[PDB]
């Protein structure tokens, strides 16, 4: 393991072979989840880029976050998908935090601290365990099958993920940069592989 504190991955040029892979000790099926991460890129209103991907042996889009051109953020689970609309686009580092629950079937999507309206999606359905969490490129299969058009060019870091659902106070503390303890993917005790042109450099954002 290693501590990525005050560190960030950098993808210099667009391609279809540079990517990192994050491993997890998960063993039992998931009935809820929450993820949080910071990222910064200039793609903006030029093309769509992948943010976070989570596939399995029978589904390429078990969990996925995308930036649909002129549409806004797209959050998809187990095939089904919803799209949170953003009217205008800026150029600055952004922090996002999404959470989903099975029984309730409600999705929450906090962007830059402010919350968005709640929505329903995929009520009563579980998520597999064997997973391949690739970062940098969207996947249409468990392994590679990347598409260069959907690659990401920029910086990303501070990737955390809990199995249960956080509360608004907890999310606010996360945003302010306080202590906490993940249980699935911990940025302070990460374990990863990397291939291609990927660099590790200090994070620009505060």
């Amino acid at each position, epitope marked *: 393991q290693t501590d990525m504190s005050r560190k960030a991955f950098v993808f210099p040029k667009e391609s279809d072979t540079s990517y990192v892979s994050l491993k997890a000790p998960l063993t039992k099926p998931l009935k809820a989840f929450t993820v949080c991460l910071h990222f910064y890129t200039e793609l903006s209103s030029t093309r769509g880029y992948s943010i976070f991907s989570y596939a399995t042996k029978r589904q390429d889009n078990e969990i996925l976050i995308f930036w*649909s051109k002129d549409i806004g953020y797209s959050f998809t689970v187990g095939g*089904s998908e919803i799209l949170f609309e953003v009217p205008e686009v800026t150029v600055a580092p952004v922090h996002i935090c999404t959470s989903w629950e099975s029984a309730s079937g409600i999705v929450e999507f906090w962007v830059d601290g402010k919350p968005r309206v709640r929505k329903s999606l995929k009520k009563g359905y579980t998520v597999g365990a064997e997973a391949s969490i690739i970062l940098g490129q969207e996947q249409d299969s468990f392994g590679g099958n990347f598409e260069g058009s959907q690659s990401l060019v920029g910086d990303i870091g501070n990737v955390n993920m809990w199995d249960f659902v956080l509360s608004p106070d907890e999310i606010n503390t996360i945003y302010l940069g306080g202590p906490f303890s993940p249980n699935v993917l911990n940025w302070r005790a990460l374990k990863y592989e990397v291939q291609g042109e990927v660099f590790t450099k200090p994070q620009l954002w505060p």
Partner: nanobody
Framework: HVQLVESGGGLVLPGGSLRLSCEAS????????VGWYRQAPGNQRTLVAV???????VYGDSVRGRFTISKDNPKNTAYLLMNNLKPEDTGVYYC???????????????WGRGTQVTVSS
């Protein structure tokens, strides 16, 4: 294989209404998103109304709050109800399906023949 069948189209006098149906086979709307695109100069399809698998929908800027689109998984059919159409709305319409709403269409996305609509007075 995959076949897309369009129905419910024609010509009507100004101010009337109509309804389009884009039935599909082989593919399933449960894990896909559908949408209707208009004709324009060159090869530029223009966004009209699209419904994603989850349920969220996106309507065209000009047609904001004019028509209503809806879907039905049981019979896997999408219906677009057009009402209060002006003469300029006449032209060529297509209904396509793709794994995810993608604004400006993409190559792989099936197109599904087409249809003609006239707003002749």
């Amino acid at each position: 294989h995959v076949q897309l069948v369009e129905s419910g189209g024609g010509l009507v006098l100004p101010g009337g209404s109509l309804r389009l149906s884009c039935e599909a086979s082989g593919i399933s709307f449960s894990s896909n998103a559908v949408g209707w695109y208009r004709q324009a100069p060159g090869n530029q399809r223009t966004l009209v109304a699209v419904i994603s698998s989850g349920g969220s929908t996106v309507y065209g800027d000009s047609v904001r709050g004019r028509f209503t689109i809806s879907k039905d998984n049981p019979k896997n059919t999408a219906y677009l109800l057009m009402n209060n159409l002006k003469p300029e709305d006449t032209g060529v319409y297509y209904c396509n399906v793709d794994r995810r709403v993608h604004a400006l269409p993409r190559s792989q996305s099936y197109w599904g023949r087409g249809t003609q609509v006239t707003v002749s007075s």
